[model samples]
Target: AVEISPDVLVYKSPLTEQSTEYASISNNSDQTIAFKVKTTAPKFYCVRPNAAVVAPGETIQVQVIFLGLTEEPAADFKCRDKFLVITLPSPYDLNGKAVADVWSDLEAEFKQQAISKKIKVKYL
Candidate 1:
């Protein structure tokens, strides 16, 4: 799991010597909190976003993987890439609808610095 709660992730990844894969999102509310696992991929974008409804104190642990290669890569992709950012798409609510992305508001309230799971990457 990620060094933090909610943000489920591995200590590191084989895809790169740099960082881990994905973050975790949970429904802390009492009502059903619907959420989605979205990928802003250049190669293959999710046709229909992956979704779930957290019942009350329900928590969804999402595993994120940065898929790439040392050399061989296809599927009309970007020449340059920022870190693979797997985030919970906003607008997704218990009512079920893709609304405008508002994860920033939630993230701002989350004290994830201490929970920010990271890899040494020194490989020493």
Candidate 2:
């Protein structure tokens, strides 16, 4: 499994949910590659530049905005979400690899991170 950095998305509060959060995807090889960013939980997230080409040896940032969630966490109602998987191609063949082939070698550049919701609670 490819490791994605900062595996957790921490939010102090949902007020900043609309504020953009970001992650970086880097291509370590010399060949330009294309990738798709997907969420296991789609309805609650808004990701931009979901799919794009990354230039050789370049890093691109993926932005995230949380949607449909309350600004504050309810103790009795904890909601858990999925990780964001950035799927890249396999073989850097001169002509590029087949879709099925590339998809099969997901570990070549597959990475993921979980969205974590954290809020501070006050105690009297």
Candidate 3:
């Protein structure tokens, strides 16, 4: 499994304007790995390189951007939203396919071998 930095994501107020934070995914294993980042509240955020492959011993930086508040939450709020990071061993031939396509083409058995980690979202 990959190592993820900052176990929690902190979005500082006023969340009324867009802001971004980074999560670092380090692949310390000997084999290439592919990973994807999923958020519970998709509408409120944007992720870049949400799905991609990382070479062995390499680290990939993921940007999670808050899209800004659509409506105000009550005072002293702690976000219940969360993020899922899933990783799997990469196939020998990606064949120039997009990360989304690679994931789509994966077999059910292969996907079963995936490792997952969670990160909580916070508004402070």
Candidate 4:
């Protein structure tokens, strides 16, 4: 399994401008693990290194950036968006293979073995 830090992503005030947050993902298992990051509100956010492989007992930092708002929402508005981090045990060596291709090449049975964690987005 993998460990995710901060559990939640909190974007501070001045929501109209771009902002970024880092999520630390650590692989604690003895095998190489592949991971991907998905968001409920993709248009509003950007993720770097969204899909990659983590060496056993290694940690990687993912960058999540808010794209900034074009207009303010209602005063009562609240961010209910969420992010999903999925991890799977690599069945084969990923050397020289694009992570994206690895994800797409996995069969349904392999995907079923995936472990997922959710992180909610909030405004401060």
Residue range 58-94, candidate 3, lDDT tens digits:
9999999999897667777779989888888886678
- The digit string of per-residue lDDT tens for model 2 on 21-93 reads 5666676766556556666667766767766556667787777666544445564544455554444544365
- Candidate 1 local lDDT, 1-124, one digit each (tens): 1112332233222433333344444555444443434444434222222444445555565444344345433434333432232323223342443323444454454325212222211111
Q: How do all models score by TM-score?
A: 0.39, 0.58, 0.90, 0.89
Query: TM-score for model 2?
Result: 0.58
Which residues of candidate 2, in runs, are more than 4 Å off?
1-3, 15-17, 75-79, 90-124
When 3 and 4 are scored with TM-score, the better candidate is 3
Model 1 weakest lDDT span, ten residues long = 115-124
Model 4 misplaced regions, further than 4 Å: none
Relative to the unseen true structure, what is the C-alpha lDDT of residue 93 in candidate 1, on a scale of 0 to 100?
47
Best by TM-score: 3
The true-versus-predicted C-alpha distance at residue 84 of model 1, in Å, is 11
Give the clash count for each candidate: 4, 0, 0, 0
Could you tell me the TM-score of candidate 1? 0.39
